[PDB]
Amino acid sequence: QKPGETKEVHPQLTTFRCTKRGGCKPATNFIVLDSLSHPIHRAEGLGPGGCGDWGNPPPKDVCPDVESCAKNCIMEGIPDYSQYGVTTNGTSLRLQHILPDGRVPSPRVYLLDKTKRRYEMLHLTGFEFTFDVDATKLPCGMNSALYLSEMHPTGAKSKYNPGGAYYGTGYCDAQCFVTPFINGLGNIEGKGSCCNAMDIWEANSRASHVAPHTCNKKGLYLCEGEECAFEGVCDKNGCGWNNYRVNVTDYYGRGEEFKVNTLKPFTVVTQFLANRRGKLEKIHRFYVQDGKVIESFYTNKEGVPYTNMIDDEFCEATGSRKYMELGATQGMGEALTRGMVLAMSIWWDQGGNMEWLDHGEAGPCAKGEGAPSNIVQVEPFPEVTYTNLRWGEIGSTY
Ligand SMILES: *[C@@H]1O[C@H](CO)[C@@H](O)[C@H](O)[C@H]1NC(C)=O
Numbered sequence: 571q572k573p574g575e576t577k578e579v580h581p582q583l584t585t586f587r588c589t590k591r592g593g594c595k596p597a598t599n600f601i602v603l604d605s606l607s608h609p610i611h612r613a614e615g616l617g618p619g620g621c622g623d624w625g626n627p628p629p630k631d632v633c634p635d636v637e638s639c640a641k642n643c644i645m646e647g648i649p650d651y652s653q654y655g656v657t658t659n660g661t662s663l664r665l666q667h668i669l670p671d672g673r674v675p676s677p678r679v680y681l682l683d684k685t686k687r688r689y690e691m692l693h694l695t696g697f698e699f700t701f702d703v704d705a706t707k708l709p710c711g712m713n714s715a716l717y718l719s720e721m722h723p724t725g726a727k728s729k730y731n732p733g734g735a736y737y738g739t740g741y742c743d744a745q746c747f748v749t750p751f752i753n754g755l756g757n758i759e760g761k762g763s764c765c766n767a768m769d770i771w772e773a774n775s776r777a778s779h780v781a782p783h784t785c786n787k788k789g790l791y792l793c794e795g796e797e798c799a800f801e802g803v804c805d806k807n808g809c810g811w812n813n814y815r816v817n818v819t820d821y822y823g824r825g826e827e828f829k830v831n832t833l834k835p836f837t838v839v840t841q842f843l844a845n846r847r848g849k850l851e852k853i854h855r856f857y858v859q860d861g862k863v864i865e866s867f868y869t870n871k872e873g874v875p876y877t878n879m880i881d882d883e884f885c886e887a888t889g890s891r892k893y894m895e896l897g898a899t900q901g902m903g904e905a906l907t908r909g910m911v912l913a914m915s916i917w918w919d920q921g922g923n924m925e926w927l928d929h930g931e932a933g934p935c936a937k938g939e940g941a942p943s944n945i946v947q948v949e950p951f952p953e954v955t956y957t958n959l960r961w962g963e964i965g966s967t968y
């Protein structure tokens with residue numbers, strides 16, 4: 571859409587680049603909200619309303635073609651990110667789901683490089699990514715997420731998309747969802763926005779999930795028809811890793827009786843281990859709390875290979891068919907090596923209560939506990955804070 575008059579004021583976030591010899595060194599980065607979360611309205615004289623809702627093409631009368639959509643739909647800058655539940659303080663990023671004015675911004679943001687015009691590209695095969703988190707105010711049904719998508723570095727800045735990454739354009743993931751704009755351009759044919767995605771962190775205070783998602787396409791692919799579906803170009807399900815699903819029920823939760831106690835803040839380490847030819851082979855997650863390393867659990871379920879790490883053998887044995895067919899752990903790693911954009915978000919799920927994260931086989935939450943109508947009785951103001959984002963050499967971030 572056309573950038574409007576209103577100025578965009580991005581929150582600044584200090585992050586770190588780490589090596590064993592040099593330790594962790596500060597770097598200046600900026601934070602940008604998703605393009606379609608900025609105010610999107612019609613050009614002067616066309617009346618009130620936006621340019622389409624999630625899941626659909628843009629409206630045909632303001633957008634009959636890309637060129638008309640590019641002048642008839644306006645995307646305003648956000649001068650005060652706090653009005654969308656997004657604030658920073660030095661090395662910390664606070665995401666608030668619900669505000670006191672009653673809105674539910676549910677923010678999704680990306681990490682911009684120091685120029686503000688290009689996303690920070692992370693290349694993590696053979697390296698590790700680490701962060702500290704406070705998950706106390708995330709009850710059953712909430713999802714705080716921190717992940718990588720293979721978005722274009724400038725947000726696909728182009729003739730009809732002059733805003734680019736400065737405005738948060740170019741979102742994609744492995745779900746191939748239909749959005750009214752893709753790469754900042756009206757999505758006239760209602761295609762889906764597809765790309766490889768590494769779900770580093772999807773969690774609340776009750777459960778923690780990790781999952782790589784492969785696609786057989788490089789970068790953002792605009793799919794049509796069956797390309798967008800389950801047997802198409804991307805792996806919807808991913809290769810999931812959750813202590814509850816592998817029958818280790820005392821690892822993570824609210825209380826001293828769990829090895830990772832979500833009543834207190836903790837550190838989350840994720841290592842992308844490669845073979846001697848440079849291809850990703852294993853994904854290893856462990857935690858640090860109160861100055862002590864907390865090793866990963868090992869699997870404990872009949873029919874699941876004994877492992878403390880994500881790998882092809884584990885993914886295949888747990889039924890992750892599309893993950894294997896669309897590239898497997900090596901394919902995930904090839905996307906990581908090309909370069910990925912960091913996304914952070916906080917959201918709930920009116921349709922299914924986030925059951926795949928923390929109910930049944932996945933956690934301790936009861937049927938209905940995760941509904942939004944019930945979340946607000948437990949915690950009226952859900953939020954998450956991420957602090958000291960840092961990445962680099964194996965063994966150097968913690
Ligand atoms: C920013 O962080 C410092 C602690 O490092 C804290 O003392 C201060 O209250 C924080 N600022 C805001 C606006 O919360």
Ligand SMILES: *[C@@H]1O[C@H](CO)[C@@H](O)[C@H](O)[C@H]1NC(C)=O
Nearest residue numbers: 816817818819870871872873
């Ligand atoms: C789950 O773990 C318990 C031990 O805590 C064990 O008795 C049970 O057999 C395990 N279940 C499966 C399906 O392996």
